[PDB]
């Protein structure tokens, strides 16, 4: 129903992830932890580092226990190494309950901590199947569920707007964070939060590709990713169609590549010339699907300025990948996302905080009759 204590518990910088406040140790040590549905390890800085303002001091915790084992976790971008252990953990603006969980004490890292991000650790909300060093290391949320009465489920609402914000509802669904109805898509396999995209549209125009290219070699939801990552083939086709749709104005190849950034006089951004993007996702009913639609306000991430001056500049937040489709923040900032683990499904609804203009709004509609959706998945 209503979780007044957890609403608005997230923060973050643009392009630097979303984090929540947590405590660790006895007495409690406060640390900001980024929310990553793309991984399954709970790790926090535990040694001095240029980009860290504070870190986990194990010798100061009377409830700390050493597991006497190291761990290495490489991410698509960034990586760290540390020592495994456990300790008491809590979430101030979350469920009023303390739990014991495994903790990786990061002692070495590379291009992982961001200068000025404001977070000092990461909370992998995915499944143990992708936990390092192996699937035996029980993930944080799993421990929270087994040690408390909290329902096996959490929801996320990421809001664009260089501060950012949002809310992480643990154990429930807050009806005030969205409008319209919630549409669920089945979780294909429990490792990453994998789903199946069966159709892609650009301003209503179908991309017309084998619905397998959309999920090659997979499609996952990652709050820990900034852009909308798209496999090479799909990326090329989308960019082409998006270029056509906005042809009334030309931009350098650097822009579409994510290198350079476009700008416009304060408040003159021509949103209307940019196309809306829709992704159709497999539904819970056979032959049934639903679609989610985002706006250029979602895929054109605002940044500083070409000359660090005063003008509205943005960066194309849609890029290609070789590890499948990644529905990152550019997708999530448009919706309230329910990670229904108990029912092996992910729900989508229009977020009541999503950025948009008076003429257009993000959407989630259904149902659409779609045949041969099972074949859309890669093997």
């Amino acid at each position: 129903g209503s979780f007044v204590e957890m609403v608005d518990n997230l923060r973050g910088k643009s392009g630097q992830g979303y984090y929540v406040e947590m405590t660790v140790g006895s007495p409690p040590q406060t640390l900001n932890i980024l929310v990553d549905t793309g991984s399954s390890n709970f790790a926090v800085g535990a040694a001095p580092h240029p980009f860290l303002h504070r870190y986990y001091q194990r010798q100061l915790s009377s409830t700390y226990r050493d597991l006497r084992k190291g761990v290495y976790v490489p991410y698509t971008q960034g990586k760290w190494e540390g020592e495994l252990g456990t300790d008491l953990v809590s979430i101030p603006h979350g469920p009023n309950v303390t739990v014991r969980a495994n903790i990786a004490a990061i002692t070495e890292s590379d291009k992982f901590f961001i200068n000025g991000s404001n977070w000092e650790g990461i909370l992998g909300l995915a499944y143990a199947e992708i936990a390092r060093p192996d699937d035996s290391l029980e993930p944080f949320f799993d421990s929270l569920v087994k040690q408390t009465h909290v329902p096996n489920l959490f929801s996320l609402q990421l809001c664009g707007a260089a501060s950012v914000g949002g809310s992480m509802i643990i154990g429930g669904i807050d009806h005030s964070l969205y409008t319209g109805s919630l549409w669920y898509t089945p979780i294909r396999r429990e490792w990453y939060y994998e789903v199946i995209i069966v159709r892609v549209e650009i301003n209503g125009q179908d991309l017309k590709m084998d619905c397998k290219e959309y999920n090659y070699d997979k499609s996952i939801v990652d709050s820990g990713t900034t852009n909308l990552r798209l496999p090479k083939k799909v990326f090329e086709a989308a960019v082409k169609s998006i270029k056509a749709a906005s042809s009334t104005e030309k931009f350098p190849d650097g822009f579409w590549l994510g290198e350079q950034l476009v700008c416009w006089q304060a408040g003159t951004t021509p949103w209307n010339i940019f196309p809306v993007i829709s992704l159709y996702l497999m539904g819970e009913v056979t032959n049934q699907s639903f679609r989610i639609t985002i706006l250029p306000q979602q895929y054109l991430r605002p940044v500083e300025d070409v000359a660090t001056s005063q003008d509205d500049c943005y960066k194309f937040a849609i890029s290609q990948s070789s590890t499948g489709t990644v529905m990152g923040a550019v997708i999530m900032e448009g919706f309230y996302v329910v990670f229904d683990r108990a029912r092996k499904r992910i729900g989508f609804a229009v977020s009541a905080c999503h950025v948009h203009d008076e003429f257009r709004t993000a959407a989630v509609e259904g149902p659409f009759v779609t045949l041969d959706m099972e074949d859309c998945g890669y093997n």
């Binding site: 392009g15 980024l34 793309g38 399954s40 960034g78 995915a126 936990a131 990453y192 820990g224 900034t226």
Partner: peptide, 5 residues
């Protein structure tokens, strides 16, 4: 700017 396993 982030790409988290």
């Amino acid at each position: 700017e982030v790409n988290x396993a």
